[PDB]
Amino acid sequence: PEKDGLFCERIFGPIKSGICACGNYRVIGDEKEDPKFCEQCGVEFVDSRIRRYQMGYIKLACPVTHVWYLKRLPSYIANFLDKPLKELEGLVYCDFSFARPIAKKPTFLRLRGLFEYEIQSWKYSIPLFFTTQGFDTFRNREISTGAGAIREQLADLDLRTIIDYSFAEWKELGEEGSTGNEWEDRKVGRRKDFLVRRMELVKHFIRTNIEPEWMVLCLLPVLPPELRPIIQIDGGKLMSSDINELYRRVIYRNNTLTDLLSTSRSTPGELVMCQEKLVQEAVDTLLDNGIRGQPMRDGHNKVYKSFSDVIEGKEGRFRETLLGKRVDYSGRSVIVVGPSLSLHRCGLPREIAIELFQTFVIRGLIRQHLASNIGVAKRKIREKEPIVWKILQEVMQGHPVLLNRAPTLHRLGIQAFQPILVEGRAICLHPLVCKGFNADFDGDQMAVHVPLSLEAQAEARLLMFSHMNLLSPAIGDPISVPT
Amino acid sequence: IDYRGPDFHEPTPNMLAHLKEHGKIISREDLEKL
């Protein structure tokens, strides 16, 4: 990558365990006396796990309003300022406004105004009335534009006074009869609800450790590099992440903002506003894309996978990554019928069993002194020695396995069983439990799982065996009857 | 199964060979270029 970049090793950890930026390696292996930084490298030699946990951080040279709190349904900013959504939406983004922040500083400038910039005449109308004494000593004192005025206003109003004023407004509204006109019928209710949610939000703000100014963020965190990697394929193929693309766009436009602002000197006009609001829109796209009017698309006529897109969705986060987890000690198969099996017994193929109880067989070989080392035991396993099956017929007796039908429908779709070794490639299943699994034999697949913990084995043996689950929980009718 | 017969369609022609007109050999194509 590069220093001060998306994969900047200087801020994150080393890309290799022990190898620094230059390339030297230090043996640590312990949490003991060792140089934390390698002088010129300044990089620790601990494992690259810190790569996936280090957080990046960028500074936008303009306050940025969070998308969730401004663009979504009844934005909390509108209730906080007691202002229409169109007004604040014109303060930023569209930029067709000029807000007035009432704050600590006195207001020797006559009157306040709220905002007015949408008329083509204002290009050369106000300059005759505006400035007239310097530029920064009038324009930069107050009347700010963009998200800065919004954030300053957020940092100005007193919550307790807001509560008192909204309570007074509620009392004033409640003492009016009306009930004569449909428009008047429905006008009071919306305003009263507005006031009630306003005091609710304000009271929540008062007694919490959260400040309102934080909804208009100024510093953007950056997701760790390893969690958004670029796949290294043979021949030089790279499968990067779109997150890198939006991040690169955002930081490049922020760099352009810093270049323009630090080179103020001959101060320009609408160009600074245009570029600053372009940066704001870029951050908006990065945070929550697909929620704005125009969703940006990459070089395939396809919208990017936004952070909200990752968070929200049946295939993104909070839905299957934290719930649907592939597990070890598992294997698919095909199901056949065995009428000779007892109710507390199933049948596992010889190929499946050796790939699930491999480690217990490694026990059996090492302990019984028929093998010496892990590599020797695995080599003996890989050559299908006749003593291997004696071990994988000896560690499986008494170790339950959970059989699971892939299209699970009811509670009895997963059941524990005592496996035995059968010859073939199919799992033999008891016929009575078939209706418990709702399983026919026209071709179906069953997944096996092995409980490793002693507590888990106790659970499987003493709670999920098909001899203490003979009744369905619907009405209490038998579930295993002669079919 | 005896093809041709009364209940089978006419034989399917080779598609390259069927293109009698809109197709020329390499030699004639080379000749007509000069």
């Binding site: - | 009364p6 006419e10 022609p13």
Partner: protein, 116 residues
Amino acid sequence: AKHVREDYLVKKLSANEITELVRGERNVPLIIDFYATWCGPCILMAQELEMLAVEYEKNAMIVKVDTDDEYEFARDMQVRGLPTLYFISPDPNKDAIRTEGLIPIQMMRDILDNDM
């Protein structure tokens, strides 16, 4: 046109062409087939003649006449039934042969080999 081979080898000739063929000099046995489209058993005769025309590549000439087109000519040739074949010797000394009905192909081979 030399690019795709013909599906059918037997060539349909008019009455005058058949008269010219029989009158003119010949060096190979001649086969004259009488047939019609509405005919029932004539499909099998057409198939058998098509098969026979392949084994005898250039040693025989096989032609057919459609009685729906040339009816009087077929009547003049003493045809009293549709599945009719005429075998013509390559020499004018030997007389012709008329066969009626759906005769087997092997007897046709015997006819134009051992008798023509």
